[PDB]
């Protein structure tokens, strides 16, 4: 499998964030979990929530009802938006699998919440 | 209601017509699925057998659907899965008798695939429970 | 007391998806080769109330489809003929001075060779008339003798237009539009459902759509987003304009062997006057027909506009002229006597010179052959105009004065006049309801 | 047996008149009554379905109207294409039964 | 759809009248109600019966047995036979069909019940 | 019973026999509608596939409408319709003994459209009768 | 149990699981049998038709099968027939918890004619007892 | 079915009596029963045993384990084997076919048992 | 091992000439003896 | 006409692929399922 982020490095505070996963090399509508993990400065890591091959949602409840995560399975990509962005927010955001003891995670991309 | 009055609803006629009354319309739909072709070199003969087994593999994936559901020979039929009130946040009288079936697929299309696993997951639940209580 | 799920089986669902479709034809031809399904004639039209769906052309497959399968029809009709590979002797041509005009000088060309016999040792003297477009210098030669053989197409079958059914299998219908005052794209209040069409003419042309289909009320104009100036802006009439087309030469078949069982029927002298094929129509009724199509251009422009007529842009005979096939013979016209006219707001016949080619590259695949063979006896030739294809020009300043021009030359707007109101959708029969239920343990 | 009487067999109009057709029921049934028009030499052809309802084609110049055992179809302005025979009919209940026939004079 | 009478135009009295109903542009196996209908001299019409997709019947009961109503599937037609013809009989046949807000009728045929 | 008398049915072995005999038959004859060709270029790619897929098209065609009257599945199915007495005036002792199913058939084949549909509407109303004592 | 711990066996993942570990998971076996070739010159013409109808076939006579035994749209149905013991003289404990159904099959290889032989005139007599007997 | 007995028509006291029957125009492995029967002199016929097509084996208890009957499928032939035979076992055997209230003998053949 | 099913009881009404056992097998022999001459090469030049 | 064959104003010959036989091997048909 194959993961890509992609979005828009900047965006503005109070405003929404939204990125895109790209998958390729598997179906997003057979197994496992799906996943967004982000890094802050200083290299840590915080779950946000997560996604099924049957479309439930689960999200981490320190992140309140911030979070919609949505995806379009016809182009087999899933999506992330964030509402009411801070700059405590600034962090690289990951699209990540993991299942079966296994964990591939793509690349990553870098965004900064500033004006 | 009779001669000129008479209905005989054709086929695909219940596309306007609402939930409710389409409610005995479904043996209609039904018998069209394999027939067509009944009557009888590359060309428009293998795009006859290509377009055969598409119509018939087709039908036998929702015929095997219906039969792990435990819906198999039956048209209306009803399980224990219990719908929740975040798929659809309106009752039954806002749903049958006063918009048809065709757009109701659309906001439901997001949440045909939750519908379809928790259906398949809970017939085997039953199964097991009537091995307990016949032995 | 609370709601349950329920599984309905035969629901009417739809979404738009395509597949390949299905022929059908009523009671030996090109097209029809006597191999699709002889359909009922029952095209059981169910009225379907309530019902919006969203058509849109120049997006449906079916055009695709259809453009894509009778190129399939026209390469298994030619496999039995005779391959024309010995065409390419060398030849000696003179101009003919047998009772001509001087509109017709040097457009005929009296030939020889020296093509064989079908014993291998034994050759023959064959004269035969050539067009000035069939020949090229060198004293001349073939124009294909750089591309690949000929065919000449069997001449015992015909190139009339057998109507043709489309149709797909079962779990997939064809729902079609009915409004008046339809468009291109855009919803529907009166979509109907036919499991099986009616009869679509596969005649082909250029500039002029011919034997087609007429409009319900007014002349509409079907385009998409118009402010491109390199999309065909398609224009179907009200009215049938009848032309009037023919070919005044009585022209003889010599039937000329070339091989074993193999024959190769040349063009004859010609018996008579040498005359120019020529396309006759109404005045009246087309500067009429004019009058309903810039009331209805002006209804998508300005009022105070001005629009103007013209040819085509130029290029290769091929693209550039109209092309019709009634007679089996080739009709190359030149169309300039049909747009030569300018609008501001506020005598039985127009003669069009038309020329014959007797070869033809008939589609864009340029690696093939159409030796049309001579027809014997004049062509009466009677057909309505029932469409146009106009490709707007460019250039224009301040949005104002702008001129519109024919073209064409793709297959693909041919049919999309005739497949406009059509699309195909696949049947769900799965679903599912909310009311009260447990199951009977 | 529901029993059809029209008012009239042969009536004189002239071009451009209003005229009113009428027809009684023997029973108070239904709407849904039908009238049929037919030109000499050619078969009948429908032209009101539902009593109030109009045909593809029918000229907007044709209303009808009435319900119970009364039942009011009205030309307007009348042409001379609407020369022709006109029936009152009912499809509620067999036997199919129909009325005597009006016939128009110009 | 189009439909074409047939059959011959003079019977005897007390004989039997067969006609032959010939449809073509419709599957007579499938909806609808085909029906025959007559004209008499002076432009009255008398309903006879009808016919069911499915090949069931009924009749007029005035005019009691004396008709039975038939078809053949395989041509696509269906047939009329009249026992026990009188000259007062004597009219215009038309074979029709009639339903879904849809009548069609054909061109007639003419027969003459005399000796 | 044994000897001269013994079972050895076969395929169509009951083809003259009698209806109460031919009843128990019914088993013999259902295995030999898919198979054949369970073992295995212009000729014979066309015409082996055509007769394999009509045959697959001819089984789902009877098992369909078996599914529509609401018992599939089922080698005998008696369900709950009444049956006109004009299609054959035979009593019980005048049918399952003294004829040969072939003949009548062709008895039974003018009126076989008026009670193949008629049972199929009883069915989608004895559904919507079940939807109603459950609820 | 959760995250990367979770079970997602998928296709033949119980192949090599006890008796009853595998038969829980007889729905994502049966799921495999029709689909797969959804989505799509003489080389891979007939080669694709051929394909699809030997699938086919397959499952129907597998359904077929099933149906004539009236086990038609079960996926653990238990009849009422009894089985002679020579076949395998062991009780349920050291069959059910311990052993996996590849080595089961070559032991019982030799009497799967005779044992399915022994169903349909399992089945059969109870709808011969159904007609006597509610009649 | 054509049936055909063949083999010795003379065997010595004590010793054993072989019979061929060949089967021709239908398979004995999915078929009816197949017996051997004697005729003796004075015209008394006995059973002596059939075969199965599924390989199982009958025999009349009078006879003990005096005989074994066996087949080749190869050669849609099976056999007769006596044992320990006395002078009044002399008799014209016959291989029968009978089923399905139909019954078809070979011609027979004739057999002395004497020294 | 062509098993033949022997059925008592029955009549059937046979009618030769009308069949489609002829009329496809002199068809699919055809097919057969065309397909088994296009591996062979041609006489072309033995018209000399 | 000195002399050719008789086929010549007709379509070439094929001399019948002389590797197989027109011996007729024996064939057998059969009804498929259901027939
Ligand atoms: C391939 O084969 C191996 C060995 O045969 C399987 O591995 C285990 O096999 C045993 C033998 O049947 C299974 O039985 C289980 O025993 C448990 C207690 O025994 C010990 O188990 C582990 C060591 O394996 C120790 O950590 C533990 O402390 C015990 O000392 C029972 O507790 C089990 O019963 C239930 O336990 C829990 C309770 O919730 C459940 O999660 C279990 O699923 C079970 O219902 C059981 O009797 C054991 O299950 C096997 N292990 C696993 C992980 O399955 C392999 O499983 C086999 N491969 C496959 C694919 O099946
Ligand atoms: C648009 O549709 C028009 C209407 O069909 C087409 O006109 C027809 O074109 C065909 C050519 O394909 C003409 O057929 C020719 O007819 C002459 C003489 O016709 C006589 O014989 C026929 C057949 O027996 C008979 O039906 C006529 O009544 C005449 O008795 C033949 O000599 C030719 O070989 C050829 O068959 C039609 O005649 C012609 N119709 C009319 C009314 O003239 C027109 O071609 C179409 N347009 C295009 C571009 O294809
Ligand atoms: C080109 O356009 C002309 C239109 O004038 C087409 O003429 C059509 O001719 C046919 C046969 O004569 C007409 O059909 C008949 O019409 C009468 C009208 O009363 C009807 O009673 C008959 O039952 C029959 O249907 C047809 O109506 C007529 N078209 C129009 C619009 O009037 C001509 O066929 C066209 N040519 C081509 C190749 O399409
Ligand atoms: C063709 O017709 C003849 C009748 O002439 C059929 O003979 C019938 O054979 C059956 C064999 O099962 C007989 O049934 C038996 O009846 C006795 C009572 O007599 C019963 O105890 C047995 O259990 C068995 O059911 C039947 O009686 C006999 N018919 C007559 C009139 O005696 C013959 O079998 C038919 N051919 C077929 C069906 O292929
Ligand atoms: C299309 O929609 C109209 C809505 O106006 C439907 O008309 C209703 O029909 C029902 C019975 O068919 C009546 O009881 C209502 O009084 C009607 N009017 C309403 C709801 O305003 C019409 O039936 C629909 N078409 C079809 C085929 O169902
Ligand atoms: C097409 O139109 C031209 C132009 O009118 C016709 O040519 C005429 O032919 C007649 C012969 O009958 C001459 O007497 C006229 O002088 C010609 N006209 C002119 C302006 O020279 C031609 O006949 C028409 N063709 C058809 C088929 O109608
Ligand atoms: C096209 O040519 C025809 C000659 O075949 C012209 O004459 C018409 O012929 C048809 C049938 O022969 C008649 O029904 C028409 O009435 C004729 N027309 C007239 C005006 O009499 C026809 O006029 C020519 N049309 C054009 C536009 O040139
Ligand atoms: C369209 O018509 C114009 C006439 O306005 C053509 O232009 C002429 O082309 C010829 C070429 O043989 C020149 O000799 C003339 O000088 C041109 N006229 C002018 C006024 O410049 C044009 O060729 C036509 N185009 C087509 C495709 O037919
Ligand atoms: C089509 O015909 C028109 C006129 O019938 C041609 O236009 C003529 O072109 C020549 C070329 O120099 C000019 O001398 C004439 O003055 C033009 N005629 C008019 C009325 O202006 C046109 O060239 C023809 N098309 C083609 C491609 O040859
Ligand atoms: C369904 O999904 C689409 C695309 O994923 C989304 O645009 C739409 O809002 C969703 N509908 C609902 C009711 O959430
Ligand atoms: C959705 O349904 C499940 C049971 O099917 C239930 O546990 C859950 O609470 C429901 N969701 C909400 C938001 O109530
Ligand atoms: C023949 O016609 C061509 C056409 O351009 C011309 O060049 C040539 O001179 C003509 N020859 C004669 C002899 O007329
Ligand atoms: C044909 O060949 C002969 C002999 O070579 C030659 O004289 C003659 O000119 C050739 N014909 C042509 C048209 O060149
Ligand atoms: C063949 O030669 C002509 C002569 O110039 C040329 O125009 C044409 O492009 C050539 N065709 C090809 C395919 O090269
Ligand atoms: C119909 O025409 C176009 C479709 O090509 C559409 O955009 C437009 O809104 C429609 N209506 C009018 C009045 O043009
Ligand atoms: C084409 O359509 C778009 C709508 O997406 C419109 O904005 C544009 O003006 C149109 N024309 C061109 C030349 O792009
Ligand atoms: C054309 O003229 C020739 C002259 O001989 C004649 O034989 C032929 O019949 C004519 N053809 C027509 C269609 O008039
Ligand atoms: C062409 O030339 C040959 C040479 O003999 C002559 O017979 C024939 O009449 C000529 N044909 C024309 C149309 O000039
Ligand atoms: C054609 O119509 C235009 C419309 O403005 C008019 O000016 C012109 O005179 C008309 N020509 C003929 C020949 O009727
Ligand atoms: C052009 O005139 C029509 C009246 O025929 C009018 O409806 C339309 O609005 C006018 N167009 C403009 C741009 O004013
Ligand atoms: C259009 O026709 C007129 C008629 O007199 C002519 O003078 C003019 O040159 C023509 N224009 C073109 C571009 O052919
Ligand atoms: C059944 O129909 C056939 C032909 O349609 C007819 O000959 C036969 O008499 C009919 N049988 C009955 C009982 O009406
Ligand atoms: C015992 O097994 C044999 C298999 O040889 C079988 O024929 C018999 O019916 C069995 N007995 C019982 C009582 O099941
Ligand atoms: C059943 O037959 C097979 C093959 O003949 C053999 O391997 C197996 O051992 C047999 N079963 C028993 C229980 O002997
Ligand atoms: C070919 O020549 C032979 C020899 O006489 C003759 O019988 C036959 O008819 C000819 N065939 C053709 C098609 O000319």
């Known amino acids: 499998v194959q993961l890509q982020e992609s979005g828009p490095g900047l965006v503005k505070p109070s405003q929404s964030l939204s990125l895109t996963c790209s998958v390729t090399?598997?179906?997003?509508?057979?197994?496992?979990?799906w996943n967004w993990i982000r890094q802050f400065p200083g290299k840590k890591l915080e779950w946000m929530g997560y996604?099924?091959?049957?479309?439930?949602?689960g999200y981490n409840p320190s992140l309140k009802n911030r979070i919609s995560i949505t995806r379009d399975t016809s182009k087999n990509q899933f999506f992330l938006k964030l509402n009411s962005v801070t700059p405590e927010d600034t962090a690289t955001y990951y699209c990540?699998?993991?299942?079966?003891?296994?964990?591939?995670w793509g690349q990553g991309t870098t965004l900064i919440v500033s004006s | 209601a009779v001669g000129i009055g008479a209905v005989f609803l054709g086929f695909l006629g219940a596309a306007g017509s609402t939930m409710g009354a389409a409610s005995m319309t479904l043996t209609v739909q039904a018998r069209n699925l394999l027939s067509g072709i009944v009557q009888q070199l590359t060309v428009w003969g293998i795009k006859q057998l290509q377009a055969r087994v598409l119509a018939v593999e087709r039908y036998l994936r929702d015929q095997q659907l219906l039969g792990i559901w435990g819906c198999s020979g039956k048209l209306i039929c009803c399980t224990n899965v219990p719908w929740n009130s975040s798929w659809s946040n309106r009752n039954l009288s806002e749903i049958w008798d006063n918009m048809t079936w065709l757009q109701w697929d659309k906001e439901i299309s997001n949440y045909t695939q939750i519908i379809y696993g928790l259906l398949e997951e809970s017939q085997n639940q039953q199964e097991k429970n009537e091995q307990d209580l016949l032995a | 007391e609370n709601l349950w799920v329920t599984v309905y089986y035969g629901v009417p669902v739809w979404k738009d998806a395509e597949t390949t479709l299905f022929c059908a034809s009523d009671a030996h031809n090109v097209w029809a080769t006597h191999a699709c399904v002889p359909t009922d004639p029952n095209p059981q039209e169910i009225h379907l109330e309530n019902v919006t769906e969203e058509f849109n052309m120049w997006k449906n497959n079916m055009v695709e489809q259809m453009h894509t399968d009778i190129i399939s029809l026209w390469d298994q009709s030619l496999k039995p003929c005779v391959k024309l590979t010995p065409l390419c002797v060398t030849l000696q041509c003179t101009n003919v001075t047998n009772n001509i005009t001087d509109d017709m000088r040097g457009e005929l060309k009296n030939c020889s060779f020296n093509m064989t016999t079908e014993l291998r040792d034994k050759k023959q003297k064959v004269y035969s008339l050539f067009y000035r477009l069939d020949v090229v210098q060198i004293e001349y030669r073939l124009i294909n003798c750089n591309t690949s053989a000929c065919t000449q197409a069997c001449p015992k079958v015909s190139f009339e237009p057998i109507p043709i059914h489309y149709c797909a299998p079962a779990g997939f219908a064809i729902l079609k539009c009915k409004d008046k005052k339809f468009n291109g794209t855009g919803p529907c209040p009166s979509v109907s459902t036919v499991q099986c069409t009616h009869g679509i003419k596969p005649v082909v042309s250029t500039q002029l759509l011919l034997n087609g289909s007429l409009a319900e009320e007014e002349v509409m104009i079907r385009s998409e987003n118009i402010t491109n100036n390199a999309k065909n802006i398609l224009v179907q009439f009200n009215t049938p304009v009848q032309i009037n087309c023919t070919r005044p030469n009585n022209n003889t078949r010599k039937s000329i062997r070339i091989g074993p069982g193999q024959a190769f029927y040349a063009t004859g002298d010609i018996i008579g006057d040498i005359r120019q094929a020529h396309c006759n129509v109404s005045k009246a009724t087309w500067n009429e027909t004019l009058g309903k199509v810039v009331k209805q251009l002006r209804k998508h422009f300005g009022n105070n506009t001005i629009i103007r007529f013209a040819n085509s842009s130029g290029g290769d005979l091929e693209v550039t002229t109209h092309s019709f096939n009634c007679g089996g013979e080739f009709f190359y016209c030149n169309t300039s006597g049909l747009f030569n006219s300018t609008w501001i707001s506020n005598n039985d016949s127009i003669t069009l010179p038309c020329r014959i080619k007797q070869i033809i590259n008939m589609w864009q695949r340029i690696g093939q052959c159409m030796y049309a063979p001579p027809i014997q006896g004049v062509i009466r030739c009677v057909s309505n105009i029932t469409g146009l294809i106009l490709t707007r020009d460019g250039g224009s300043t301040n949005s104002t004065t702008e001129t519109f021009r024919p073209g064409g030359g793709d297959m693909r707007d041919n049919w999309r006049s005739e497949l406009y109101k059509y699309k195909v959708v696949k049947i769900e029969p799965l679903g599912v309801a909310p009311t009260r239920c447990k199951r009977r343990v | 047996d529901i029993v059809m009487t029209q008012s009239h067999r042969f009536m004189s109009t002239s071009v451009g008149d209003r005229v009113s057709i009428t027809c009684k029921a023997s029973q108070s049934v239904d709407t849904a009554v039908a009238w049929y028009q037919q030109k000499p030499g050619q078969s009948p052809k429908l032209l009101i379905y539902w009593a109030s309802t109009r045909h593809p084609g029918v000229p907007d110049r044709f209303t009808g109207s009435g319900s119970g055992t009364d039942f009011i179809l009205t030309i307007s302005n009348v042409q001379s294409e609407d020369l022709a025979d006109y029936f009152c009919h009912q499809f509620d209940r067999y036997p199919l039964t129909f009325g005597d026939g009006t016939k128009l004079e110009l | 759809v189009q439909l074409q009478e047939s059959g011959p135009g003079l019977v005897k009295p007390s004989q039997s009248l067969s006609l032959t109903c010939?449809?073509?542009?419709?599957?007579?196996?499938?909806?609808?109600?085909?029906?025959?209908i007559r004209q008499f001299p002076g432009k009255k019409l008398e309903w006879?019966?009808?016919?069911?997709?499915?090949?069931?019947?009924?009749?007029?009961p005035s005019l009691k047995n004396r008709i039975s109503i038939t078809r053949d599937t395989s041509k696509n037609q269906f047939f009329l036979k009249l026992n026990s013809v009188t000259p007062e009989d004597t009219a215009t046949?038309?074979?029709?069909?009639?339903?879904?807000?849809?009548?069609?009728?054909?061109?007639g045929t003419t027969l003459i019940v005399s000796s | 019973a044994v000897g001269i008398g013994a079972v050895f049915l076969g395929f169509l072995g009951a083809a003259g026999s009698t209806m109460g005999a031919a009843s128990m038959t019914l088993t013999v004859q259902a295995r030999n509608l898919l198979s054949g060709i369970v073992q295995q270029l212009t000729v014979w790619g066309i015409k082996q596939l055509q007769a394999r897929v009509l045959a697959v098209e001819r089984y789902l065609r009877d098992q369909q409408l078996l599914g529509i009257w609401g018992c599939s599945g089922k080698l005998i199915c008696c369900t709950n319709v009444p049956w006109n007495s004009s299609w054959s005036n035979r009593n019980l002792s005048e049918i399952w003994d003294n004829m040969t199913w072939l003949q009548w058939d062709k008895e039974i084949s003018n009126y076989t459209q008026i009670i193949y549909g008629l049972l199929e509407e009883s069915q989608n109303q004895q559904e919507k009768n079940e939807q109603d004592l459950l609820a | 149990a959760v995250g990367i711990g979770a079970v997602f066996l998928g296709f033949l993942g119980a192949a090599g699981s006890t008796m009853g570990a595998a038969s829980m998971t007889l729905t994502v076996q049966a799921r495999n049998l029709l689909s797969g070739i959804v989505q799509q010159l003489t080389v891979w013409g007939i080669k694709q038709l051929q394909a699809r109808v030997l699938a086919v076939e397959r499952y129907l006579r597998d359904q077929q099968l099933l149906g004539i035994w009236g086990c038609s749209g079960k996926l653990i149905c238990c009849t009422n027939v009894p089985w002679n013991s020579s076949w395998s003289n062991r009780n349920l404990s050291e069959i059910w918890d311990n052993m996996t159904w590849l080595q089961w099959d070559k032991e019982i290889s030799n009497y799967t004619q005779i044992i399915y032989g022994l169903l349909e005139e399992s089945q059969n007599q109870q709808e011969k007892n159904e007609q006597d007997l509610l009649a | 079915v054509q049936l055909q007995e063949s083999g010795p028509g003379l065997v010595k006291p004590s010793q054993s009596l072989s019979l061929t029957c060949?089967?021709?125009?239908?398979?004995?492995?999915?078929?009816?029963?197949?017996?051997?029967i004697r005729q003796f002199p004075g015209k008394k016929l006995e059973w002596?045993?059939?075969?199965?097509?599924?390989?199982?084996?009958?025999?009349?208890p009078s006879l003990k384990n005096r005989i074994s009957i066996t087949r080749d499928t190869s050669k849609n032939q099976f056999f007769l084997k006596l044992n320990s035979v006395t002078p009044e076992d002399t008799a014209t055997?016959?291989?029968?076919?009978?089923?399905?209230?139909?019954?078809?003998?070979?011609?027979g053949t004739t057999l002395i048992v004497s020294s | 091992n062509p098993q033949e099913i022997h059925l008592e009881n029955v009549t059937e009404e046979f009618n030769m000439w009308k069949n489609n056992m002829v009329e496809q097998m002199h068809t699919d022999i055809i097919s057969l003896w065309d397909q088994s001459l296009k591996p062979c090469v041609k006489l072309t030049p033995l018209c000399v | 006409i000195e002399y050719r064959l008789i086929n010549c104003n007709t379509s070439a010959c094929t001399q019948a692929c002389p590797k197989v036989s027109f011996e007729p091997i024996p064939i057998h048909y059969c009804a498929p399922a259901g027939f």
């Open positions: 990540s699998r993991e299942g079966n003891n296994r964990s591939y």
């Open positions: 090399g598997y179906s997003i509508t057979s197994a496992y979990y």
């Open positions: 996604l099924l091959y049957d479309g439930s949602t």
